[PDB]
Design a protein around this nucleic acid. Structure first.
Ligand SMILES: Nc1ncnc2c1ncn2[C@@H]1O[C@H](COP(=O)(O)OP(=O)(O)O)[C@@H](O)[C@H]1O
Ligand SMILES: Nc1ncnc2c1ncn2[C@@H]1O[C@H](COP(=O)(O)OP(=O)(O)O)[C@@H](O)[C@H]1O
Ligand SMILES: Nc1ncnc2c1ncn2[C@@H]1O[C@H](COP(=O)(O)OP(=O)(O)O)[C@@H](O)[C@H]1O
Ligand SMILES: [Mg+2]
Ligand SMILES: [Mg+2]
Ligand SMILES: [Mg+2]
Ligand SMILES: [Zn+2]
Lengths: 565, 621, 621
DNA sequence: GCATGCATGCGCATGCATGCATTATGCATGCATGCGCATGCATGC
DNA sequence: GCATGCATGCGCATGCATGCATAATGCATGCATGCGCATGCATGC
């Protein structure tokens, strides 16, 4: 064991030392600038990398890994001691909490002489005056672990995990230190909290009440108290790491002030945390002794082009898929044996926000939302808000699910009115559907693609060659960039000029006239014109042009013609 | 407590006896290599055969079975001594090691229904199924605290179940110094061990008909935490003890009995190389021929079943795409063509085999379900038949009686091999990679020859495309074929097991020739033994072949030839449509044949065999 | 209790400091040889100078004086470490060793009257007299028991005063087995340590006049059991602590304070060989001359006092007969002849000297007494002045005022040297070998010259025969003798101690010459230093001379000559009768002179000196 | 030497600080299961 | 495809074994010392 004073001094010198890294290509005092910002209310939390510390001392890193909480507290105290040195000016604008801190420090200077004896209980709690939080970043050398294998050997260690989010709690304030005022004195009493539950005090420990033996009684205050942001997270294993025949395991995470509001249900996250237990008191058990429940305390959470190049053919369908991803509802009907499911899988993997449903497995409560112990939790349609949703084997779905899907496509909101639930849910998502061989699809959807397997010898032979190549060389014959391109594209919004309207109008009229000439035609309406306008706007957005052009309209017309034929 | 013991004849003698038991110097014992293996694998417990101990020292075995705790303590002390002797450095890591038990306990082999107070404080063996499991929880053993006021650290030791009875003086968590200075707990320096509780029920197959079941409660310590799961058939060997109730004045006199586990069991080269290298094609030839002597003929179905046993190759790519590697078969035939016998044989031979008939299991019991746990309010997943049979076999008898929705549910398993589950509050993707056997009767009771197979089968094209192979079996009443069948059946009927007296009531690579089971003519050939067959099947399943450039163009050209012959086949009808899945089926069967003969690459002969199978199955007269 | 301590800066640093204190490698320290002496003598405690510790390490001394128990524990641990280091074999015998303290404590030097609560928990030094003592009693430390029913032996450890506070769980004697089988105590295998309690009172000489005394209670452990006795002046160094009262509900708030002793003290070659061998006769010549410069003349009395200091030889024979070896003297003289000065000087110089005047002590307080102890009802013996002065000196001033019965009592001591005591229930023979000085005034105030000495002395012949020597001193008023006396007295009066300023208020073998204390004429001779004189006297008292054949016949013939001259001495009277004791006196004085000059045998010159002394003392003009 | 004085000595009562002996009953909590309700799935015709 | 049946499913009440919380007073014993008694020692005259 080593004395904490020496390591505290080492921490202080490490914070004062580093000059190395700068983004603009120079040598910049990073931690000094961070501390100067911390001096005032220009930064309310600080993150420390354990890769930068590894340059000078690895034993510090190991001791931090095995005894993380103590080192977190030591770091907090060291930074708090360093703060007065770097301070250069008073606060330009301050809020209520700063007003208490300043007033308390001012009267502490007013009253306390340097020589008088002060009881250990007479000091201010450290965390009450402090207003900055310290968190750690996991070592790059350290390998992320699996939820299944963290056990009693890992209690108290520093770990890094990767998982899928399933449950998130709404933000609520959590008590840190409670403040009490006596009934017959001007003194203030502070009660730190480090337990799930606590018992409020009654009598006043202040010196004046003790000397007079007045028996004054304490009262809580909320303004003087310190509160923090608190969230609760549920994570599960990836399907890849589950052993044979088992079921994914779950873990619970707790989230602090600035880390709050980072993750959403359904996201894949990487969490740097400390593995700590909770002493459990409750119903009696078989085995005597001290049992506990484990949980994780987080300190950092981190979340034309070729589309599905493995699948041969369907180039126009791929262009339509690109347009749907870029944005301004697509349905595919095909014979069995044509890979429609794999296109939907690729779409789900590519999209940032996406969901993929297979049929009756996610039917009913899997869609819409339900009430659970009370909080309302949404289904796939709710999760895919402002994303893209994918549905396979559409015709096999129950009628209620199809009605809900139609409502989402047309109205873009869901309405639920049943015993215990009365809500309207926002679902601004575009739908891609797959099915096997109706007027509803033609009337409601925007674009339908019919894939018929005509046994042409040349096409079949080329498909066979491509499949053999894929199976043998495990690569197509000769996503991050695509995601970045789509993100940059969606930033702009082109506009339709006044003149082109006439041209568009003419086209529409002529199209309808042809549809009226061909009595075998089925649907033309203003919805088709709206779809054409949306496709042209999407193409103009792809060109990053401010004004809609002729080529976009021609390509949209050609795509609609190809789909209809 | 300052009380100490100076002499104890029984304990010292028992320790000496175990020391002599585990020496293995002047004997053919193996425990030395077992200890070396434990040191190599960083594990900290040993399993010792009870029958071996009884053979070497019967008195010690009798005492251990009759009295458990003290003898087990002596065992653990002897293990500590010998681990220190062989390598004292490794013994520093762990406090104390543990002993497992194994062998035929005899009279103490006891069912959960027959556990009684007569077996208390002894070591018992029990066979059952697991019904309830609990979350893993840590328990404190050694606690460490630090005092910022005085810069002093202290440590407290805990021992609760080490001693039979505990007192309020122990199990007290320290929080304050001698001068009331606060202490700060330091979780890194403390010591914890895992703890779990499970429940075991007598298997419904063994329980008397019409009677309610009986169950036992088991505690799993730090090592055996993850060794059990609900819905599992296990055998547990351990002590049977009473449970001390907490302090009180008046007691009713009824204790709680809990079984403390010590062993948990999941009940279940030159020859191979020479045989494979010498035989090559004859490997699969004999394996197909010697699949099941009890079944007469049907070489194609035997070949297909062997292809299921060997299987294809699972492949993955950069984009996360998944390509199926399993095979699926559907048999349709007239009654009494021994389809169910084939299914039962595949159940017996395959490692992970589950039978699920048509209406025996519904769509929920096939894949999985979600249930709300009343104890906590959370959502939990319960696995179905197909999820349990990961990388295994599911047999479906009377496949035609299955409802449409169940088949739509099975689509997800048959296409991609995964199951997607979702209900508000939880959603998951479970792995269900599996292979399916199915047997379905014709719609008209007996297969009509004149009508095309589409009318007789009565199944949609999508479901047919889901299956890799379709086979049709008929009972042709040829007098010579009937004579052969009668000969075979009566030869099997007249046979009696060797070593059993007549009239009573009730490993070589190649099986020994039998006068009746094989016949005089078959002396020129032999059949492969079942055990070697299983070993070879496992080895072949391990092997990973690769496709060659010679056969890819050949297979592609033949696929194009079939899709063009679609117009040429005018004299006969087609059983199944030809889609993109047919090419994958060709490659899969080629790889299965390449697995049959141990090699490194897929050759042309495997492609030819696959194509022969496809041509036979896909068209009928 | 499983609680343990991992780090403690203060205790570890203090142990390191004591380790460096007791190294004595790069220093002139002696403690290594002290430890070797302890190992040689089988003793198990050490005495360390406090001033030495303060010189080497002042902070440790300050902490030890201010805080005792923890620092003493650290000392004992360091002793165990170094005893193990030097010789680990010897450290096995004893559990833990102990530390004594010595040196000038300074402010903490405290009288029993000035002990206060301010010195609690510190190490204090106290000077006092012993008044009450108790019987030695054993105390159990480690207990061992055996069970004939199960043939098992157990051991229990006890620690009562090792810990500050004890609880009912400890200090319980085991009597039954876990199955109620009786246990048999085996006293041989157990461990016991002795225990005693004494009481100390402030000495009456130091207490303020007219005030009642105050006392302290002391506990003596196993080593210091027999180191104290009642009626003894001692100095005790030890801890001053409170006494924990036994359990109760309501407490008055007054503790009992008891001093726990750690040290108990009874307050008190080439040169010698060369001086003796060179001087021979000059040894006793100078010793007689340099006996006391403060006293003028009287060479015969100085010779006699020197003979007392050296003494005779005690002899024993086969039949158990005892022969006296002590000498006794009586001085009678006119007032102001400095008899009391001689008595006081003999008190100062002699090792065991006790003054007992005529009526100051009675016959009971001289020899001994028997008292009935009210606590037990038994009979106990209390020693008197003469029993305490075994092999010592008793000085009796104003011997004439002593009553007759006291002198009859002193007869037993003077003749045989033993005291016989008897009262129904007890009888004993105590040893009282001793020598007596006595000074008595003449009956007529001033010695009458014309009357015979028998009238002036007024003592019976038996008592005179009891004494070895009689001397008569007179104040003759010769002008030159008076001038010499005045010179000597005023020279002594004008003298002042060197190093003391005038007008202020209030080792070499031969003493340095002084201008006034010796004089200019005496430069040709020197006087012997007091310390060397005491050392030589002790060495001479050790030496055991033997009588030669040359002098025995000579002494016998001279004794016969004296007993015949009894008729020849017509011009002078006889002071003392001549009996058989005179011959023993001759031999005794001869042996004393032979002791004066270190040799092996008694020679003729010693006999001649003895006879000169006898002739001078026994007759007067 | 005999007559008298008298400091020492012993046994049983009370007063006062510490110390010793005694000792079941009533109320609260979690596990098991009935009873009313709405959703939802499956099965006919 | 629409009308009906219905095995599954959920939330709040009571009943019953274990388990939890409470909580000074009166009587006995050894140490200190007074008061009556007989023996015995020492001191005069
Ligand atoms: N154009 C294509 N290119 C490559 N592979 C294809 C193509 N069409 C079909 N496949 C293969 O055929 C299989 C089709 O199965 P699936 O997509 O599940 O059919 P469906 O989606 O109609 O149920 C896929 O595994 C895929 O590998
Ligand atoms: N090829 C065959 N070889 C041996 N026995 C056969 C054969 N075909 C039929 N059998 C006999 O006929 C019976 C058929 O029963 P089963 O397998 O239940 O027929 P299915 O499954 O067609 O209803 C079996 O008991 C079997 O002994
Ligand atoms: N021979 C001597 N030498 C020195 N001083 C003497 C001598 N004789 C007598 N004195 C003095 O005379 C005093 C006699 O007092 P002290 O000894 O009490 O006489 P005594 O003992 O005879 O009554 C002493 O103080 C001493 O100083
Ligand atoms: Mg599909
Ligand atoms: Mg059958
Ligand atoms: Mg005198
Ligand atoms: Zn107050």
């Amino acid at each position: 064991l080593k004395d904490y004073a020496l390591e505290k001094e080492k921490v202080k010198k490490f914070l004062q030392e580093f000059y190395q890294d700068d983004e603009l290509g120079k040598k910049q005092f990073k931690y000094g600038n961070q501390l100067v910002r911390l001096a005032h209310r220009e930064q309310v939390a600080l993150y420390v990398d354990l890769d930068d510390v590894a340059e000078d001392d690895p034993e510090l890193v190991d001791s931090i890994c095995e005894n993380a909480r103590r080192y977190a507290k030591l770091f907090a105290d060291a930074v708090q001691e360093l703060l007065p040195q770097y301070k250069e000016r008073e606060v330009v604008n301050k809020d209520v909490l700063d007003v208490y801190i300043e007033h308390r420090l001012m009267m502490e200077q007013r009253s306390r002489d340097p020589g008088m004896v002060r009881s250990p209980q007479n000091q201010y709690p450290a965390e009450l005056m402090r207003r900055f939080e310290l968190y750690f970043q996991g070592p790059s050398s350290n390998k992320p672990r699996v939820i299944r294998e963290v056990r009693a050997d890992s209690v108290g260690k520093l770990v890094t995990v990767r998982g899928i989010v399933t449950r998130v709690s709404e933000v609520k304030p959590k008590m840190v230190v409670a403040t009490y005022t006596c009934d017959q004195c001007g003194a203030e009493t502070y009660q730190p909290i480090q337990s799930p539950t606590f018992m409020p005090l009654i009598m006043c420990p202040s010196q004046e009440c003790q000397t007079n033996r007045s028996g004054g009684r304490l009262y809580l205050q909320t303004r003087g108290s310190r509160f923090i942001k608190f969230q609760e997270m549920k994570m599960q294993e990836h399907s890849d790491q589950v052993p044979v025949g088992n079921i994914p395991r779950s873990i619970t995470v707790l989230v602090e002030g600035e880390n709050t509001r980072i993750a959403q249900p359904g996201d894949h996250v990487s969490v740097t945390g400390i593995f700590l237990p909770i002493l459990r008191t409750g119903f009696r058990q078989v085995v005597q002794g001290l049992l506990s429940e484990t949980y994780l305390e987080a300190h950092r959470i981190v979340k034309a082009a070729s589309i599905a190049p493995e699948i041969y053919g369907h180039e126009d369908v791929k262009k339509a898929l690109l347009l749907l991803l870029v944005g301004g509802n697509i349905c595919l009907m095909g014979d069995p044996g044509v890979a429609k499911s794999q296109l939907l899988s690729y779409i789900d993997r590519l999209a940032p926000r996406s969901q993929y449903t297979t049929g009756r497995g996610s039917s009913g409560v899997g869609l819409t939302a339900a009430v659970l112990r009370l909080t309302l939790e949404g289904g796939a349609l709710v999760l895919a808000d402002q994303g893209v949703c994918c549905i396979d084997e559409f015709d096999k779905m129950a009628e209620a699910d199809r009605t809900a899907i139609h409502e989402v496509m047309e109205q873009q909101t869901i309405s639920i009115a049943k015993a215990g639930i009365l809500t309207t849910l926002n679902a601004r998502c575009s739908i891609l559907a797959a099915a096997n061989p109706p007027a509803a699809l033609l009337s409601r959807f925007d674009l339908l693609w019919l894939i018929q397997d005509r046994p042409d010898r040349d096409n079949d032979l080329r498909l066979a060659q491509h499949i053999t190549y894929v199976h043998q060389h495990s690569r197509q014959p000769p996503m991050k960039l695509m995601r970045r391109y789509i993100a940059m594209c969606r930033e702009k919004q082109p506009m339709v000029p006044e003149s082109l309207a006439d041209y568009i109008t003419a086209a529409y009229v002529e199209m309808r006239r042809e549809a009226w000439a061909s009595k075998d035609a089925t649907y033309t309406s203003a919805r088709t014109l709206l779809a054409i306008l949306r496709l042209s706007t999407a193409l103009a957005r792809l060109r990053m042009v401010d004004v809609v052009e002729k080529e976009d309209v021609n390509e949209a017309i050609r795509l609609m013609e190809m789909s209809k034929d | 407590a300052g009380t100490v013991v100076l002499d104890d004849v029984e304990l010292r003698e028992a320790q000496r006896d175990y020391l002599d038991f585990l020496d293995d110097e002047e004997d053919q014992g193996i425990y030395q290599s077992k200890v070396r293996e434990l040191i190599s694998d960083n594990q900290y417990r040993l399993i010792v055969n009870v029958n071996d101990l009884r053979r070497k020292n019967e008195k010690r075995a009798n005492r251990l079975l009759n009295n458990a705790f003290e003898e087990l303590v002596a065992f653990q002390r002897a293990l500590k001594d010998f681990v220190a002797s062989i390598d004292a450095t490794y013994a520093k890591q762990y406090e104390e090691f543990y002993v497992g038990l194994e062998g035929s306990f005899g009279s103490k082999h006891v069912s959960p229904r027959t556990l009684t107070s007569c077996f208390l404080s002894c070591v018992v063996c029990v066979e059952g199924i697991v019904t309830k499991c609990s979350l893993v929880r840590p328990k404190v053993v050694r606690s460490v605290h630090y005092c910022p006021a005085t810069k002093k650290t202290i440590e407290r030791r805990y021992s609760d179940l080490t001693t039979l009875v505990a007192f309020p003086s122990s199990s007290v968590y320290p929080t304050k110094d001698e001068e009331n200075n606060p202490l700060e707990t330091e979780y890194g320096l403390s010591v914890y061990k895992d703890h779990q509780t499970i429940t075991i029920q007598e298997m419904p197959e063994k329980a008397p008909a019409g009677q309610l079941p009986r169950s036992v409660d088991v505690i799993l310590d730090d090592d055996l935490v993850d060794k059990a799961k609900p819905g599992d058939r296990v055998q547990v060997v351990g002590t049977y003890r009473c449970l001390p109730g907490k302090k009180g004045g008046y007691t009713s006199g009824t204790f709680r009995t809990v079984l403390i586990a010590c062993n948990v069991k999941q009940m279940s080269i030159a020859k191979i190389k020479k045989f494979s290298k010498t035989r090559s094609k004859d490997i699969f030839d004999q394996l197909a021929k010697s699949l099941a002597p009890s079944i007469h003929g049907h070489d194609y179905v035997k070949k297909a079943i062997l292809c299921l046993l060997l299987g294809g190759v699972e492949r993955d790519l950069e984009n996360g795409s998944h390509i199926r590697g399993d095979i699926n078969i559907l048999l349709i035939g007239d009654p009494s063509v021994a389809k169910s016998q084939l299914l039962r044989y595949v159940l017996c031979t395959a490692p992970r085999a589950i039978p699920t008939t048509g209406r025996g299991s519904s769509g929920v019991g096939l894949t999985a379900a979600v249930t709300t746990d009343q104890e906590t309010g959370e959502r939990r997943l319960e696995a179905g038949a197909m999820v349990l049979a990961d990388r295994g076999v599911v047999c479906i008898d009377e496949f035609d009686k299955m409802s449409d929705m169940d088949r739509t549910a099975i689509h997800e398993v048959m296409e991609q091999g995964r199951v997607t589950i979702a209900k508000a509050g939880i959603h998951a993707r479970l792995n269900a990679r599996c292979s399916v056997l199915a047997a379905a009767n014709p719609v008209y009771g007996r297969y009509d020859q004149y009508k095309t197979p589409m009318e007789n089968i009565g199944l949609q094209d999508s479901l047919l495309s889901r299956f890799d192979l379709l086979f049709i079996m008929l009972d042709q009443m040829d007098p010579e074929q009937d004579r052969e069948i009668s000969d075979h059946v009566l030869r099997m009927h007249r046979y009696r097991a060797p070593g059993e007296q007549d009239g009573d009531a009730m490993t070589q690579i190649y099986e020994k020739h039998d006068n009746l089971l094989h016949g005089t003519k078959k002396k020129k050939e032999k059949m492969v033994s079942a055990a070697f067959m299983k070993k070879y099947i496992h080895v072949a399943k391990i092997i990973k072949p690769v496709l060659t450039q010679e056969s890819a163009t050949y297979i592609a050209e033949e696929y194009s030839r079939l899709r063009s012959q679609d117009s040429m086949s005018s004299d006969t009808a087609r059983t199944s449509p030809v889609t993109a899945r047919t090419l994958e089926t060709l490659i899969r069967l080629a790889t299965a044949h390449a697995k049959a003969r141990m090699s490194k690459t897929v050759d042309l002969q495997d492609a030819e065999e696959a194509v022969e199978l496809v041509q036979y199955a896909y068209f009928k007269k």
